[PDB]
Each structure stands twice: as C-alpha cells, then as structure tokens.
Amino acid sequence: SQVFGVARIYASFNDTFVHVTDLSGKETIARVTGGMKVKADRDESSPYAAMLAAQDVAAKCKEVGITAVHVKIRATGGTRTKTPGPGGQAALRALARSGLRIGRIEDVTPVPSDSTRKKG
Amino acid sequence: RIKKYEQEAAEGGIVLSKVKKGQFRKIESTYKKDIERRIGGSIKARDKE
Amino acid sequence: QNDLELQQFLRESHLLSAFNNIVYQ
Amino acid sequence: AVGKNKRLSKGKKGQKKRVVDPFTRKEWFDIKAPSTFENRNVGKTLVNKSTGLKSASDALKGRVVEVCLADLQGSEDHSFRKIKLRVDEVQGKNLLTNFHGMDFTTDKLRSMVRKWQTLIEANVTVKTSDDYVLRIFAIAFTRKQANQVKRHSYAQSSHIRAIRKVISEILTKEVQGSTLAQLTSKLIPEVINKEIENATKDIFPLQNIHVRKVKLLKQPKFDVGALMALHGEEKGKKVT
Amino acid sequence: ESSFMTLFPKYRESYLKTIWNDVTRALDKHNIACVLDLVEGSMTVKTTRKTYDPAIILKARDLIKLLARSVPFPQAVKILQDDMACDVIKIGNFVTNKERFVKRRQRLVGPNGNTLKALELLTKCYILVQGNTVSAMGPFKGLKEVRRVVEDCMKNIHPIYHIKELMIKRELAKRPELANEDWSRFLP
RNA sequence: AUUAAUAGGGACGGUCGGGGGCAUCAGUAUUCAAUUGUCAGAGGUGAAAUUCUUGGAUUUAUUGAAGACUAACUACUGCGAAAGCAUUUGCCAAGGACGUUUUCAUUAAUCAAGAACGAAAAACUAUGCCGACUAGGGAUCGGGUGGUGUUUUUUUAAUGACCCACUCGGCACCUUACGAGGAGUAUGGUCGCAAGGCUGAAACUUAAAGGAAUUGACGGAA
C-alpha cells in the first residue's frame, strides 16, 4: 500500500524544474517548468510558480496512484553556485501540503572534483 | 576588545584591512559608540617618541 | 578614485551601516 | 512563459493530440531484492505496453534501481548508504535483481571531512571469485590521542604510503577470499573497516575509516541457477 | 528520520557553549531538535514526529553549516529567516601567482573594509572572506550580483567599477520610466 | 709526516620533503555521440534580446568517447636560487638538516665582465627606520639524546603514534639591551575661444512650410 515514487527537483536560479519519476529513474510520470506555469518570463522561479507547479504534479501523482515520495533536491552546481532555489523550497512545501507522504528527502547537486577553469 | 576581535579573526581565519602600527582598528563598535573623538587615533606621546 | 560622490560614499560606508542597523544619498 | 507578452518563434506551431494516455496504456510490475538482505520486497516499475514481452524483457532487465540501505535493511538509524542494483530476471509480476553498486552520500562526506587533520584515499580494481570485476574506493582519517596537546595530528609520507598499502592489501585479499554474495553480507556490518582498524593499529591512530565507493566494471554471463539459488515451474488456469 | 551533522573547531566551541540556548530555542520553535557532542566535536540537527516543514529542516542544516563556518548568531537568524540564502564562492581556482592572489583579495576587502561594506549595503547581504572561501548570506538578487562581482574581482576588473555599476543600476531602475532600455547607453 | 677552527669539502646511518624527469592507475565535472522516457518551452538578463527547441529542446536513466583540472582535506605552512611546486603506484637521478672518538688539510669569501635558469595583458592603497644586533617567550616544521607511562603487542613481522625535559637548523610572529613647492588670487601683455539679431533671404522686404505665439479677431445693448 506504500507505493513509492521519486521527485527530481532541479531548483535553479532561473527556473524551478519539478519532475516526479518512477523508482528506477526512466519513466517520467510528470514534469512542469516555472516558465511553463507562470505568465511572464520575469518570475519564472518564484514560490508562486513553485506552488502552481506543485499543484500540477500533485494532481498528476494522485492521477497515477503513487503514495510516497523520495525527493532529490538538485542545484545547478559545478561551475555555478551550489545553492538551491526558493522555488525549490516552496515546491517541497506545497507538495507536502497537497499531501504526498514525506518519504525521504535528500540533495544531490553536481559537485566538481576539479572545475574546468582557466588557470591564467 | 580590539585584541579579542583580532584573535577571533586570526583563529577562525578572516582577512582584514591592514593598518599602520600606530592606530587601533576601526570597528562597528567605535563607529556606533563614537569613541574616536574622546580617545583618539593613537598614543600621540608614543607617536612623537 | 578621482570621483567625488564615490569616495565619500566609500568612507561613509561603515557610518551608514552603523547608524542604519539604503538612504545613502 | 504561458503569457501574452511572448512573441512568435517557430515554437508551438503543429502538435499532435494527446490520445495515447500513457498510464492507462502502461502496466505495473514489482521488483525484488536478493535474499541476502532482510527486507526483500521493494518498489514498483512501469512497463510501457504488453505488445512486447520482448519489451518487458528489454526495459525491465536493462533497468538499474537505487535504494537507500535503511529502506533495504530496516536499519533504525537512517544508515547513510545507497545501493545500486541491476535487475535481469522477472518471474510473474515479480522481478529478480542482482547487485550493481554502492556509494556513500554527499552529506555524509562533507560531514566526515575536517580542517586540522589528514584525509587518506585509496582505490583497488580486483576480479572476484565469481568472475566479477569490481573497483573499491576506501577513505580514512587520522585522529589525535587524548594525551596530546598539539591541535593537529598529521601523518608523514612514509606513514600515508604504508597506510594506503596495507589497506589495499586487506581489500584485495578479502575480496579474493570471499564471493560476491558473502562480500555483500560482509559489507552489511562494516566489519572490514573494524578489521582495517585492528590491523593498521600498529601504524597510526585513526578515527573514521570508510569504503566510499563500489563500482562494477564487467559482468559475467547470467546464470538462472546462481540468481535463483540466491533468491530462494508455474501452472495456469485452463482458459476455455 | 531526517538528521544531519557538522563538525566544528574548538575556538568556536567556546562560543557555541555560551550561546547554545538560543539555537535550540529558535529551532524547537520551528520543531527542530538540536544537540551537541564534544568529543565528536560536532553539532546535530534532527526532526521529530511533529515537524511539518522540509524547507525549514534544510534551513537548519544550513544553520549548523554557517555556524561551523563561524558567522555569529544575528547572521544565523538572518539565514533562518525565510526568503534569505547562504551561498559559498571559491576564488582559489583562478590565478597563478600566490602573491597576486593575496594582493587581489586585499583589493577586494579594501581599505577599512570599505569596498566590502559598500557592497554589503548595496546588496543587503553579508560577506565574509576566508582565504579560499567567501561566504555570503542574503536575498537572491544580491547573491547573484555579488557572485558576478567577486568572480570578476578575482579576475581583474575593479570592485570600484562594480560599485559604480551597482549604484547607477539601482537608481536607473528606481526611476520608474524605463523598463525596455538595455541601459548600456549609461553604463561605461 | 703539529692540529683539524661551534672555517670549508667528503663518506657513512637513519630520515625528511604538494623538490625534478618518465610512464603508469583513478576521481568527478564539462562537451559530444548513441539508447529509452513524458511532451511544451529552454537560455540569459534588472527587464530584454541573439540562440536552441515536433526530425521531440531542456530534463531524468544508460553507457560510450575526447580535451583540460585534481576540490572538500589547504595552512600558524613544507620544498626549490627565482618563476614555481598538490590523485595512485613503480623507475631513474638529484638536495637539506640531523648523528658519527669518520676523511682531507685551509682547500674559505665579496664579486664587477661571461653564462644558466624566468608561465611572461601587467598594475590600481599598500610603508615597517637601518644595522658589523644584546637578551628573550610562546608557536610550528625536520632530526637526534633521555625519562616516563599510556596507546601498542604476544616465536613473529617493519619496535610505530602520544607526554615531557634536553639538543641543533629553518619559516614566521611577538617584546627588548646596543650601535653608524603645495595652495589660491589678480591680470588692460602674448596666443587662442569668440558674441547675436525668427528660419526661407539674396543682387529681390519675396512664396510654401516650420517652430516659437497659442482663450481667434472685430462691433453693439445693459
């Protein structure tokens, strides 16, 4: 009765990618973007876009029949900052508030071993 | 207070404005509490010395 | 460093912080 | 960019209709971990369509899943360990997997690493007794004694080189003294790290010794015998 | 369930023990438990069976991370404020000569810290410079701006050019007559 | 056939080092290629725009490949004459210091001319008297001398780490005895800047249009 799916959240500094997925990581059960749910291009990372994108993926999750989430938070990382997005946080908020049983939270953002920067 | 501030910086390594040997530091303490006018930059007697 | 407004703002940068905790003009 | 200020590119010009309805054309299968661990039952997976039993085999045996070891073992502590698994066999809404790999987690790494001390890394690449080719990354940390008043306990060059050597020795020796099944049940209690402590006790004081990574290189040829004898012939209902 | 840890050094451990009521007060106010292990030399943050905010437990992880990197408790509650953000910027991966590296981060910090403090005012964040790491905490717009600035600063443009850019930008956006213009007619 | 200088070279014993050349093994990240996934934007900016994106962009999984770098550990530092110097294991060859009732026998030193070594947009607030230099203290790094217990272990494998006293040499830091024209003003001179009248427009009082001017103007009755 505890059916588990996962949620990859690429929370950038210019969009909030929310993406529920099967447990293996190939079947993309749903996907919405901040720039697909907010009106203008100016606010394509705001917590309003987070709440809306979260409600869309929540509707889709209760459409398919998943009962629990493993949320993986990811930032842009590597060359740019290692910091997540406010859309990321509010998305996790509104997903828990629409009521996906909070299975397991983890962050995996791409961290460089040694970055490709010009040692001038 | 300046010495304890300098020690906490150099123990948990921070950089700081390098000043000459005479004067003290310049902190938010001295800027807010306005202590320069009633103490000064440095010991003027030792400065002339 | 020849500018007039710039360096005055630069040395007042701690005073405005101290008496603030921006209206810098 | 759902708004009206957006100008016109190529963009959303010609688009087919949502008719396919993927999750009413899809199917739900269940996967099963080996029997060496405790909790065998784990997760679910989506089959695209039963027009291919070829397709069921293709997707559901090319799969690679990844669980956390608390989810796998029922550990009351969330025991900071991710296990990769690679599935190859299905028996009737119930897939049978094998083992693929195992990494630590990034938060635990940034928890381990400190400031006034020394981190040691090592890597080995062995062939197992059941013909698997594996690569193991192990890490270690120096510590200070209680009597010490010095605020750092570094190790010198002969120390670090001898340390990496002896841990490489115990790594290759133990992985070639055991199979992959007993190797997995040997990495379950982390008794290899306790062995490394009570073996390199005569070199240098250590506080945190860990195997960071386990990666596969080459897989042997699949045996239904081995996989099934690990996991611990069916008849139907006469449709008229 | 959800739990995280972070190591610290001892000279901060004194400060930790002297202030430790305040962190556990704010965090059980957010229903976040925190504890402290001395021989481990570590802090721990965990949730309980009543916690209802994943954003705030990620925030508490950021709290112990910042407090390990030795920022005081006013800045700690400023990051546990909701719409703020920590951000770490490394500079050690830019330049070749060590002495040029030293003089360049001194050019950053400036005489009487003045360049740093003007930057902090104009972005409403807080900066702190530690050798090869520079920590910053504040709102996201200021953080993006300071990231661009410090990367060009350990490149070879000057922070004074950037400070003039910042004040001109903030004024030109303050006057609510222009939102279409690319403003490069005004920036040099 | 004098010594062997707290002069110099040399050997040996244990060491030390992100010192050097040669391959070698590996971490991730990025870029491209290919495989599958759901189908509607992605990028960047203050907001924009260029660009990519029904031949399925971005994104999730899989490998694959190339070309750079070896983070967190990383600094109160080590090593090199300087620039420089950070994964692994070998191979080769140098070098400092320690310690020796070891070797020679003053072979040392300051260097102008000559030679070797030096990635080669760079820089932009930094500055402390100086010394043929007296004492010092806490820290480190490297070696030896001794004690002491831990930690260790024990017929078997490298007799290592820590406490403290002593002892040499470094990098640093901290207190100390001592000594060798800028300004502004004025300008009857000199060289330059040069000033305005509606515009057409001048030999023509000269058209349209243009801005300026903007409540058009002209008479009666109370």
Instruction: Give residue limits of the domains in chain A.
Output: 1-120
The DSSP output letter for A23 is S
Q: Report how far residue A16's alpha carbon sits from residue E25's, in angstroms, rounded to the nearest whole number.
A: 32
Contacts with C1 from chain E: Cβ below 8 Å:
160
Segment holding E164, helix H or strand E: helix E159-174
**Angle formed at CA E59 by CA E56 and CA E61, multiple of 5 degrees:** 120
Residue type, C6: L
Using a threshold of 3 CB pairs under 8 A, tell whether chains D and C touch. Answer: no
Three-class SS state of A17: strand
Q: Report how far residue D210's alpha carbon sits from residue D192's, in angstroms, rounded to the nearest whole number.
A: 9
Q: Which residues, listed in sequence order, are joined to residue D82 by a DSSP beta bridge?
A: D68, D103
- Contact criterion met (CB below 8 Å) for A33 and A106: no
Cβ neighbourhood burial of D88 (10 Å; 0-12, 13-18, 19+): middle
Q: Report how far residue E149's alpha carbon sits from residue E157's, in angstroms, rounded to the nearest whole number.
A: 9
Q: Report how far residue E77's alpha carbon sits from residue E66's, in angstroms, rounded to the nearest whole number.
A: 11
Q: Report how far residue D89's alpha carbon sits from residue D98's, in angstroms, rounded to the nearest whole number.
A: 9
Contacts with A18 from chain E: Cβ below 8 Å:
none
Q: Report how far residue D91's alpha carbon sits from residue D96's, in angstroms, rounded to the nearest whole number.
A: 7
Nearest of A65, A48, A68, A49 to residue A7 by alpha carbon? A68
Interface list for E 21-50 with D (CB within 8 A)? 42
| CA-to-CA separations, D88 to D44, D216, D223, in angstroms, rounded | 15, 15, 10
Contact E10 D151 (CB under 8 A): yes
Strand order in the sheet with A16-21: A16-21, A4-11, A68-74, A101-107
Cβ neighbourhood burial of D207 (10 Å; 0-12, 13-18, 19+): middle
Q: Report how far residue D163's alpha carbon sits from residue D121's, in angstroms, rounded to the nearest whole number.
A: 10
Q: Which residues, listed in sequence order, are joined to residue A69 by a DSSP beta bridge?
A: A5, A102
The DSSP output letter for D190 is T
Residue pointed to by tokens 């690319």: E182
The DSSP result for D73-112, as a single string, is H--SS---EEEEEEEEEE-SS-EEEEEEEEEE-HHHHHHH
Which technique was the structure solved with, according to the deposited record?
cryo-EM
The DSSP output letter for D201 is G
Please state the φ and ψ torsions of residue D216, each to the nearest 5 degrees. -85, 150
Of E3, E5, E9, the CB nearest to D115: E9
Hey, how many other C-beta atoms are within 10 angstroms of the C-beta on B21? 6
CATH for A1-120, among 3.40.50.10190, 3.40.50.2300, 3.30.420.80, 3.20.20.80?
A: 3.30.420.80
Report the DSSP pairing between strands A68-74 and A101-107.
parallel
Of B12, B14, B18, the CB nearest to E12: B12
Three-class SS state of E125: coil
- Which residues lie below 8 Å from residue C12, measured CB to CB, with a gap of 6+? C24
Nucleotide closest to E161 measured between CA and C1': F124
| CA-to-CA separations, D16 to A79, D12, D13, D21, in angstroms, rounded | 38, 11, 10, 13
Tokens of D6: 């957006």
Cβ neighbourhood burial of A22 (10 Å; 0-12, 13-18, 19+): buried
How far, rounded to the nearest angstrom, does the alpha carbon of residue D129 sit from its chain's CA centroid?
Answer: 19
Residue pointed to by tokens 């998305």: A91
Of A80, A89, A119, the CB nearest to E96: A119
The DSSP result for A69-111, as a single string, is EEEEEE-S-TTS-----HHHHHHHHHHHHHT-EEEEEEE----
Nearest of D219, D197, D203 to residue D88 by alpha carbon? D219
Contact B28 C18 (CB under 8 A): yes
Residue type, D10: K
Q: Report how far residue E125's alpha carbon sits from residue E117's, in angstroms, rounded to the nearest whole number.
A: 10
Q: Where are the beta strands (DSSP E) in E24-182?
A: 32-37, 42-47, 85-90, 126-130, 133-138
